[PDB]
Design an enzyme around this catalytic site. Structure first.
Site, PDB file in Angstrom:
ATOM      1  N   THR A   1       3.788   8.053  -9.988  1.00 41.93           N
ATOM      2  CA  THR A   1       4.964   8.049  -9.100  1.00 41.93           C
ATOM      3  C   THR A   1       6.312   7.476  -9.684  1.00 41.93           C
ATOM      4  O   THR A   1       7.339   7.606  -9.024  1.00 41.93           O
ATOM      5  CB  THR A   1       4.509   7.351  -7.818  1.00 41.93           C
ATOM      6  OG1 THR A   1       5.475   7.500  -6.736  1.00 41.93           O
ATOM      7  CG2 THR A   1       4.358   5.793  -8.079  1.00 41.93           C
ATOM      8  N   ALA A  49      11.180  -3.184 -18.406  1.00 41.61           N
ATOM      9  CA  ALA A  49      11.856  -3.563 -17.219  1.00 41.61           C
ATOM     10  C   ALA A  49      12.040  -5.057 -17.321  1.00 41.61           C
ATOM     11  O   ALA A  49      12.766  -5.554 -18.147  1.00 41.61           O
ATOM     12  CB  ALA A  49      11.160  -3.107 -15.971  1.00 41.61           C
TER      13      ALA A  49
END
Lengths: 201, 216, 238, 196, 202, 219, 245, 233, 213
Positions: A1, A49
């Site tokens: 996703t 990240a």
């Protein structure tokens, strides 16, 4: 996703696909790097990240499972790696978060794939990905993906996906690190550049 | 950068070191917001017999560091078997107290100038109220870092290891200038000298206000 | 007896025999000599092992970039104390950032060792430590007892049959003060060999040296440069 | 908080409960093959519903607790007793720093009345009942059962109630949800029911 | 709030204190006494808000009390003013309480201190304090000189407080004046029927 | 809200209060006693927010009890002040309680007013609740600042009656609590200023507006 | 009694029908074993004279020293076991350091002495630990409290003395103090006296050999506890030697 | 009575002298460092065929490339091994690479002697453990064999034996085992020495062998491998 | 990156280029805490062995805290692991600091530039949140891409042959260092005084002060 460590299941293997990337998505701080790390030979994962955060939780997951597997002489499953990561990370929460690891191993009830994210989501699906840009990618891939794809057959699938992905994607200074995991072993198919695969395919 | 709101402030303290001595002018006068509560205040501390330190920024905050330094020195001197306050020891220790407080989202602001003489080396050091240590040539503190320091640096550039006297005229000159450029100043200022004798800081002495210039 | 059931058990004289009996444990340990000049602090030590077909694990321990120790007594207890000292030395390096004083460090060992000797139903630590350390006031070589008292010596030998070695230390007591690094180590070897019988003369293999000083930080020579100090042989000087 | 979709229709021939597989983070679905009814014991279920992550979290702890009573007592635990103990455990977690509202859905075998469903609100309130919905959806489904009620309702009639809802859910509801797991539970095992 | 002042005497101190602490319109304390002791060696005059001063006031009392009885000869004043400092170091971004400490200890001899609400402690000749009791800057400077005579000091203190209560609003009602010698505090209460009234500001 | 005063007179201490205890400006209850009787020696008036005042009096009462029994000295109002200041600090200055502690020591009778501040406040004669200044202001006005006991008792009752008249929040009976250190005379009706109108006429109904289908007693 | 496995010397919570505590008493016999430490109050300071035990042939100064600085202006001379003395130095120095920090004036000896004594006394009460095997003096000069001398024994008593001795020779040494007027007398003259008392009292069986250490804390040092100069030590040594002959 | 904490006039503690004896009670374990790798051999010494021989273990893993044979009370050792597992992976989180034989052994040895029978914390030992451990593996540095004692004296070895035959075996190893003897020959040397303390002859159900060799992780020898060394002893 | 609030700023810009065994680390020669630069002298760089040279810059309060710590971690590592400080020292320290600075946001980029104690050269880059990677180009500061590019273009030689047709030598890297520093002053306005480049080898520490051009 979402990207940054992503896996989809087959019978024969799982596909492990990951990015080499440094920093946020706005610039790299290096060019040479591989962020791909082998915590256990059970599978590979690596993100980006919030960098300290992904490495921290996986390192705990790696510690617990590896000790238990190695001493006991009983192989740890997809379910076990996922349960350790989950239990640890909610507790640690409030000390930055952003873990996006994809857990694989073959179990007594057959091959099991769980997707571990830093929200506390633990998901099985056709293909799942945690991190950022694969969110778009799961749409085209599902069409070109069978429930059970062979390893060779799967390698050709990655090459086409990617080759269009580089054209759409505008993130530079990456490599697609391709690994197929045949169970409680992990081998590296190729570590091909995203810029190379558009020409090939 | 952030700094706490200051009520009682110490501002402009110059320090430049000569051989086996330093000369300092620091205000003896600490304004509290508006009112000059103590025109007689002493920003100078005695760590030990051949050390002195002078500090700027929030005066209040300076006193917190004095006690921690004081309790550590009290235990360490007197015995002097091989352990006592030493020039390196005071600089680093005081830096760590400041670092400890830097970790919390409120830090105790004082910016300090250590002149010491330890076991073999004469040191002129700068300590910050968030931490950091180095040897220094000339340093300002509080308001001196923004406002006069560059013109003081410029005089130092031909001769970096000049005499006490040459420093003494600059410092005496600097109060007429203090009044002119910044507001929370008094012209009763303290001359502090750290030498091998001890740390001496006689009472506030004064000279001209000189804001009576208007000639263009 | 029953002046040593617990380390709270006094003798009518006014002495705890267990703390004294703990010193007899130091004599079971391996011979170590501590010497100082005016620029170096030198530790000369005897390493023993059960396999001599294998390299002997050091008897010189790391405490600071200018502090090293040599143990005589209980091996586990010496390491146990060592960790308290190591934590403090490394901490002293963060906070104070001087090269920490031997006199300062040693008194803190005196507070901790006193805890079990003060406490009932416990044993003292029966290990005697010789510490070499260099601060900016020059070298110091200190001896710490199984009790808590310290001596600042110019030379000391605690360990097995240490009397034989002292006879040498008494004889060249004046010499120690003037020396450079090389001279300190040759004297400590000549001392070290004496503890042991007449017909046994050391090898480099079972000698570890911890050298500390003004021109150097912390280097341990296990056989590295041990061979030149050993040279110029002298065999058991009476 | 209530903006899931559960319905449980209790009868003593069967109890039909259905839920969507639709745990979605970002824009796509992390679960869409995982079942949303968890097995506490082989005849007992807890259905945890709220936020996607908080659901998986509630179950694992609870699973340990049900089994543990089974071990302790040396018989299957009392339904009444479990349901109340699951209410005390959800209120205890509510105190703790992370505030968790969780809609639990209790399926139990009780000494009476037969197959039983005990109903749990997002007021963290244990309630005995017949005719329940969980989620934002609770509000419409409870009402449809109210027009036509039966609490001994046969399986054919259960399909009719379901189908009037499914066409409505597809066009009027914000859950078109073509991905659903539907199960009908007799007192011995879990049987899979048709999905529209 | 209250006009509090202390001016240094012959080798000891002369005090002045008001009797209202006001929080705007509502009086926090209608009656305030800042002449009472806090040990027999030290006295202090407490200013700022009512709650901030009271909490400081009870701790210095406790510490000081233990110290004179434990030592056997009384403690010195320099200790009392440091005890107040400690408290303020915690409360230097929240509360503030501006205490000005004066009396005399026997053991080391006379002291006049100002411990602030930021935490400092420093020796002064005379300090007057409070928020709106800062309006006597001229008055304190002209009146205080180095070793002022006791008769002059008494007049100047009463006179300074009067200028305060009229000009600042916060001040008001009975001025409590205290003159202290080496072991004794003697208080006089000056009427609030007496006040010298301000002359032609219009 | 509440209107409480206690006084230092030439006798002992007279507390005056209106009845009503209100949760804000609305009455939770129109019955009971606002001025509370504790142990025999201690009486406390209550004012401001209800929730903060009742509980503060109660907690200090345990502490004071321990101190009275052990020490075997009668309770001192300065002593009482310190305990409230320390307790209220512990809580962290939450809620509003203007509290009136009044007890007789072996010396004079001593009265103190402690507001919620956590102050060491010495009054002269004080009234609490509402606004501290506003209630206190009355004492300077009617008292010449000392008059005979009987004259003073009519005086407090009259001043408190005026605050009841001016501020309708206080309602029902005005109670006077004459407090010594073993004698607590709780005079319910010092003055009744107002009372209701009789609730003689019903609003009852027969079942035909709501009915009952059960009357059973479970076991 | 002394040979036993329950109570007596194991405990100190024990009492005899006389009332005695034997363990606390055994601690007292321990202070007696080593040589004397004297500390003399002047109206202007304290002067110490300590025998510093020479336990080897490879000595350096300050080795096994018994002179400690509790506070800047407090000196501490110990007698008896040095093991127990090191732990006692840490506790006394710590109570003083915090005092200076808080109060900001020179620690009153009367206060410091009360706190260390309480600590020794907490151990003598207890049968859970033994009590310190040394006895010490704290001596000081200040102008905020005057010149003070205090003495703390293994029992946990603090009382002020104007001239004290702890160690083997103390009954003999103390007598020599009654001879001297020392309450009013410069610290310069008193150094000469502490040195001569020690030289005569020493004998080769209280301890093998000693190194003379005298210390200042008075008008001469200006209220600082420091060790005496090389000059001072030697003239005081000389006078000790000349009186010895 | 007298305590056990006390030092004797010999100049050693009582509890510790007993603990060495505890090492002597159990089964013998041989750990040989060869430069081709490190082999650890232990005797099963089973007395019943109803036992399953795989699950009699006395070689347990500290690490994934360090193996450990333990001797004396089997139970008493197991706790030390439990704490060791947590440290090796912990070492991976911090350093980002796997623990060495030296690092692990010094850290467990600190715990070995801490004993205060009365007036000591329940989170600390009342008595020392009577176990000798042999930590044998090949790590980043190379093949290393370290020996740990219950006295908390650690030393580096090439050939060490502990258990009932401890003094006898250790002397006998020094003789055959040298660094001019290869890894397979080390396995033959251990087998001969093993027999006196054993009640029966050597078999593949009466030894358990595991070798950690360069470039490889820890391997537990299978029945075929055990049987090839049995053929020629 | 982030604009100094959490901890004091002290400016400075770090460039790092790895060759094969010679690595240049450059940062400006200044100690800052305030907008002005206190003194040119610095102790941002600290050497632990000739094997490893560390540079911590930016905020001066951060710089002293971590660098001393690194000296402690080195000492501990030589004792226990028995591998002398180098690569191994570097990986370990970056994890513990980066946890410490990143909830209250990181304002120091420590760069360990060394050789492993087994050999092979590593140049290690943290963002400020724990990552360690080996690089042949590095840019670090707020301007964490301004130097990176020159090392990417010139060192890697990806679409470039006019800095070298291969890969830089030791003689070539030092020539390039002086040039790069002169360039930096033009773009980045947060510097005063001098720029200091330290070249770290396994066999030679080099230091050079270079005036701000």
């Amino acid at each position: 996703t979402t990207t940054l460590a992503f896996k989809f299941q087959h019978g024969v293997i799982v596909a492990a696909d990951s990015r080499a990337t440094a920093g946020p998505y706005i610039a790299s701080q290096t060019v040479k790097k591989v962020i791909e790390i082998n915590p256990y030979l059970l599978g590979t994962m690596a993100g980006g990240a919030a960098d300290c955060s992904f490495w921290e939780r996986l390192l705990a997951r790696q510690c617990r499972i590896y000790e238990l597997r190695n001493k006991e002489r009983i192989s740890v499953a997809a379910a076990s790696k996922l349960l350790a990561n989950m239990v640890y990370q909610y507790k640690g929460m409030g000390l930055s978060m952003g873990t996006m690891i994809c857990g694989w191993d073959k179990r007594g009830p057959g091959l099991y794939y769980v997707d571990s994210e830093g929200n506390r989501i633990s998901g099985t699906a056709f293909s799942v990905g945690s991190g950022s840009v694969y969110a778009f990618g799961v749409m085209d891939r599902g069409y070109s993906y069978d429930l059970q794809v062979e390893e060779a057959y799967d390698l050709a699938r990655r090459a086409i996906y990617q080759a269009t992905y580089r054209d759409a994607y505008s993130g530079g200074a990456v490599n697609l690190y391709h690994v197929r995991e045949d169970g409680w072993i992990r081998v590296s198919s190729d570590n091909v550049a995203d810029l190379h695969d558009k020409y090939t395919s | 950068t952030q700094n706490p709101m200051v009520t009682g402030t110490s501002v402009l303290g110059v320090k430049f070191d000569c051989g086996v001595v330093i000369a300092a002018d620091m205000l003896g006068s600490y304004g509290s917001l508006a009112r000059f509560r103590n025109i007689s205040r002493i920003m100078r501390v005695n760590d030990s017999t051949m050390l002195g330190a002078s500090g700027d920024y929030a005066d209040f905050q300076y006193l917190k560091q004095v006690l921690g330094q004081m309790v550590i020195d009290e235990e360490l001197f007197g015995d002097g078997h091989s352990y006592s306050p030493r020039a390196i020891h005071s600089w680093l220790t005081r830096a760590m107290y400041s670092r400890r407080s830097k970790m919390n989202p409120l830090w105790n602001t004082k910016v300090i100038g250590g002149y010491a003489g330890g076991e073999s080396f004469l040191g002129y050091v700068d300590m910050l109220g968030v931490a950091y240590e180095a040897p220094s040539l000339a340093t300002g503190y509080g308001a001196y870092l923004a406002q006069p320091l560059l013109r003081e640096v410029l005089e130092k550039q031909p001769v970096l290891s000049q005499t006490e006297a040459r420093e003494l005229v600059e410092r005496c000159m600097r109060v007429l200038y203090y009044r002119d450029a910044r507001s929370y100043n008094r012209f009763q200022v303290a001359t502090v000298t750290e030498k091998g004798v001890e740390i001496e800081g006689p009472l506030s002495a004064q000279t001209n206000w000189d804001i009576a210039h208007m000639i263009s | 007896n029953q002046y040593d059931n617990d380390v709270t058990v006094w003798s009518p004289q006014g002495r705890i025999h267990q703390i004294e009996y703990a010193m007899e444990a130091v004599k079971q340990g391996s011979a170590t000599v501590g010497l100082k000049s005016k620029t170096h602090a030198v530790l000369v030590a005897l390493k023993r092992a059960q396999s001599e077909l294998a390299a002997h694990q050091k008897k010189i321990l790391h405490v600071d970039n200018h502090i090293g120790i040599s143990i005589a007594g209980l091996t586990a207890d010496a390491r146990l104390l060592c960790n308290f000292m190591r934590q403090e030395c490394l901490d002293s390096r963060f906070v104070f950032d001087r090269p920490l004083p031997v006199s300062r460090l040693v008194s803190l060992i005196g507070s901790k060792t006193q805890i079990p000797t003060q406490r009932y139903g416990r044993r003292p630590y029966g290990v005697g430590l010789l510490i070499a350390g260099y601060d900016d006031m020059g070298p110091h070589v200190f001896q710490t007892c199984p009790s808590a008292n310290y001596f600042d010596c110019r030379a000391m030998s605690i360990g097995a049959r240490s009397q034989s070695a002292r006879t040498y230390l008494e004889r060249h007591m004046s010499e120690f003060m003037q020396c450079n690094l090389d001279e300190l180590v040759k004297h400590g070897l000549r001392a070290l060999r004496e503890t042991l019988p007449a017909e046994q003369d050391l090898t480099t293999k079972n000698v570890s040296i911890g050298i500390v000083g003004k021109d150097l930080e912390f280097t341990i020579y296990d056989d590295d440069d041990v061979s030149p100090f050993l040279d110029g042989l002298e065999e058991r000087p009476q | 908080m209530e903006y899931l979709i559960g319905i449980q229709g209790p009868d003593y021939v069967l109890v039909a409960s259905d839920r969507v597989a639709a745990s979605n983070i970002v824009q796509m679905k992390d679960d869409h093959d995982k079942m949303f009814k968890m097995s506490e014991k082989i005849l007992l279920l807890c259905v945890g519903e709220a936020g996607d992550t908080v659901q998986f979290a509630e179950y694992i702890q609870k699973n340990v607790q049900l089994y543990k009573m089974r071990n302790g007592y040396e018989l299957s635990p009392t339904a009444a007793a479990n349901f109340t103990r699951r209410n005390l455990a959800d209120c205890l977690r509510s105190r703790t720093p992370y505030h968790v509202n969780l809609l639990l859905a209790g399926y139990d075998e009780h000494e009476g009345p037969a197959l039983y469903y005990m109903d749990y609100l997002a007021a963290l309130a244990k309630a005995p009942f017949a005719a329940h919905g969980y989620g934002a959806f609770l509000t419409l489904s409870i009402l449809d059962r109210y027009y036509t009620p039966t609490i001994s309702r046969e399986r054919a009639v259960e399909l009719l109630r379901k189908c009037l809802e499914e066409l409505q859910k597809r066009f009027i509801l914000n859950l078109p949800t073509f991905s659903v797991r539907v199960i009908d539970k007799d007192g011995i095992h879990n049987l899979e029911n048709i999905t529209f | 709030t209250t006009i509090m002042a202390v001016q240094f005497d012959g080798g000891v101190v002369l005090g002045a204190d008001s009797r209202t602490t006001t929080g705007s319109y509502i009086a926090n304390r209608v009656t305030d006494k800042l002449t009472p002791i806090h040990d027999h060696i030290f006295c202090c005059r407490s200013g700022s808000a009512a709650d901030t001063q009271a909490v400081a006031d009870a701790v210095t009392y406790q510490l000081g009390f233990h110290s004179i009885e434990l030592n056997e000869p009384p403690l010195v004043h320099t200790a009392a003013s440091l005890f107040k400092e400690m408290c303020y170091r915690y409360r230097e971004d929240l509360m503030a309480g501006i205490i000005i400490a004066g009396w005399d200890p026997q053991e080391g001899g006379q002291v006049y201190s100002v411990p602030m609400g930021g935490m400092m402690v420093r020796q002064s000749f005379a300090i007057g304090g409070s928020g709106s009791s800062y309006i006597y800057g001229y008055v304190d400077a002209t009146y205080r000189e180095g070793m002022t005579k006791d008769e002059c000091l008494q007049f100047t203190a009463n006179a300074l407080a009067l200028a305060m209560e009229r000009d600042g609003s916060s001040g008001g009602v009975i001025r409590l004046a205290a003159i202290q010698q080496s072991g004794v505090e003697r208080q006089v209460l000056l009427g609030d029927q007496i006040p010298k009234v301000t002359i032609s500001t219009l | 809200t509440t209107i409480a005063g206690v006084v230092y007179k030439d006798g002992i201490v007279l507390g005056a209060d209106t009845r009503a205890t209100e949760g804000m400006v609305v009455a939770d209850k129109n019955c009971s006693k606002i001025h509370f009787i504790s142990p025999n020696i201690y009486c406390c008036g209550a004012g401001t927010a209800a929730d903060t005042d009742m509980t503060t009096q109660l907690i200090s009462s345990n502490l004071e009890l321990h101190s009275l029994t052990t020490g075997r000295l009668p309770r001192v109002v300065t002593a009482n002040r310190m305990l409230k200041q320390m307790l209220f600090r512990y809580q962290g200055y939450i809620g509003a309680a203007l509290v009136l502690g009044g007890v007789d020591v072996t010396g004079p009778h001593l009265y103190s007013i402690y507001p919620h501040g956590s102050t060491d406040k010495l009054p002269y004669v004080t009234m609490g609740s509402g606004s501290l200044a506003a209630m206190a202001v009355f004492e300077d006005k009617f008292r010449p600042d000392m008059e005979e006991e009987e004259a003073k008792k009519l005086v407090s009752e009259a001043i408190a009656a005026g605050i009841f008249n001016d501020l309708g929040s206080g309602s029902n009976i005005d109670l006077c609590v004459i407090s010594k250190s073993k004698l607590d005379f709780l005079r319910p009706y010092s003055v009744p200023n107002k009372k209701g109108t009789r609730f003689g006429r019903y609003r009852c109904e027969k079942g035909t507006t709501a009915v009952l289908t059960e009357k059973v007693t479970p076991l | 009694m002394s040979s036993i496995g329950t109570g007596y010397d194991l405990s100190a919570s024990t009492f005899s029908p006389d009332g005695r505590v034997f363990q606390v008493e055994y601690a007292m016999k321990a202070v007696e074993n080593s040589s004397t430490a004297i500390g003399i109050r002047c109206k202007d300071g304290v002067v110490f004279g300590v025998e510093k035990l020479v336990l080897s042939k490879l000595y350096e100064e300050g080795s096994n020293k018994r002179l400690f600085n509790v506070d800047r202006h407090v000196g501490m001379a110990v007698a008896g076991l040095l093991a127990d003395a090191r732990s006692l130095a840490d506790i006394a120095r710590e109570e003083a350091s915090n005092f200076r920090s808080n109060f900001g004036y020179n620690i009153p000896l009367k206060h410091l002495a009360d706190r260390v004594a309480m600590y020794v006394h907490a151990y003598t009460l207890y049968s859970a630990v033994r009590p310190f095997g040394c006895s010490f003096m704290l001596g000081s000069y200040s102008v905020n409290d005057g010149a003070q001398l205090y003495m703390i024994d293994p029992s946990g008593v603090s009382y002020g003395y104007w001239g004290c001795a702890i160690g083997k020779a103390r009954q003999a040494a103390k007598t020599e103090i009654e001879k001297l007027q020392m309450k009013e007398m410069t610290c310069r003259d008193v150094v000469k006296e502490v040195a001569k008392i020690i030289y005569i009292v020493h004998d080769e069986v209280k301890d093998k050999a000693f190194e003379l250490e005298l210390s200042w804390v008075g008008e001469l040092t200006k209220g600082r506890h420091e060790i005496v100069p090389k000059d001072v030590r030697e003239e005081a040594e000389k006078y000790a030697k000349e009186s010895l002959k | 009575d007298r305590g056990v904490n006390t030092f004797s006039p010999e100049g050693r503690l009582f509890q510790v002298e007993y603990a060495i004896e505890g090492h002597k009670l159990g089964s013998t374990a041989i750990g040989i460092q060869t430069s081709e790798g490190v082999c650890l051999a232990v005797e099963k010494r089973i007395t019943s065929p109803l036992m399953e021989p795989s699950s009699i273990e006395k070689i347990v893993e500290i690490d994934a490339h360090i193996g450990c044979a333990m001797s004396g009370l089997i139970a008493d050792a197991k706790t030390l091994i439990d704490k060791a597992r947590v440290e090796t992976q912990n070492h991976w989180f911090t350093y980002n690479e796997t623990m060495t034989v030296e690092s692990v052994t010094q850290a467990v040895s600190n715990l070995a002697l801490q004993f205060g029978e009365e007036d000591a914390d329940p989170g600390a030992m009342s008595r020392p453990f009577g176990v000798a451990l042999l930590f044998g593996g090949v790590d980043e540095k190379g093949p290393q064999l370290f020996h740990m004692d219950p006295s908390g004296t650690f030393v580096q070895c090439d050939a060490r034996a502990i258990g009932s035959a401890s003094e006898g075996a250790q002397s006998s190893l020094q003789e055959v085992y040298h660094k001019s003897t290869t890894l397979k020959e080390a396995i033959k040397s251990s087998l001969i020495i093993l027999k006196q303390v054993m009640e029966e002859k050597l078999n593949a159900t009466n030894i358990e062998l595991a070798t950690v060799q360069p470039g490889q992780n820890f391997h537990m020898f299978t029945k075929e491998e055990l049987e090839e060394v049995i053929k020629d002893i | 990156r982030f604009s100094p609030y959490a901890f004091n700023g002290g400016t400075v810009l770090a460039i790092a280029g790895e060759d094969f065994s010679i690595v240049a680390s450059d940062t400006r020669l200044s100690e800052g805490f305030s907008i002005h630069t206190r003194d040119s002298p610095k102790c941002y760089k600290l050497t632990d062995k000739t094997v490893i040279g560390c540079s911590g810059f930016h905020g001066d309060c951060l710089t002293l805290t971590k660098i001393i710590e690194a000296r402690l971690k080195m000492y501990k590592h030589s004792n226990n692991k028995a591998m002398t400080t180098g690569a191994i020292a570097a990986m370990l320290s970056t994890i513990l600091y980066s946890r410490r600075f990143f909830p209250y946001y990181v304002y120091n980029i420590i760069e360990g530039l060394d050789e492993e104690g087994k050999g092979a050269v590593y140049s290690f880059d943290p963002v400020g949140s724990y990552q360690r990677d080996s690089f042949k180009a590095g840019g670090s500061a707020s301007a964490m891409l301004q130097p990176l590019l020159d090392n990417q273009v010139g060192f890697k030689n990806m679409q470039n042959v006019e800095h070298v047709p291969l890969t830089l030598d030791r003689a070539m890297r030092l020539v390039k260092d002086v040039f790069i520093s002169a360039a930096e002053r033009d773009v980045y306005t947060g510097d005063a005084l001098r720029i200091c480049i330290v070249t770290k080898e396994g066999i030679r520490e080099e230091t050079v002060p270079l005036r701000k051009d």
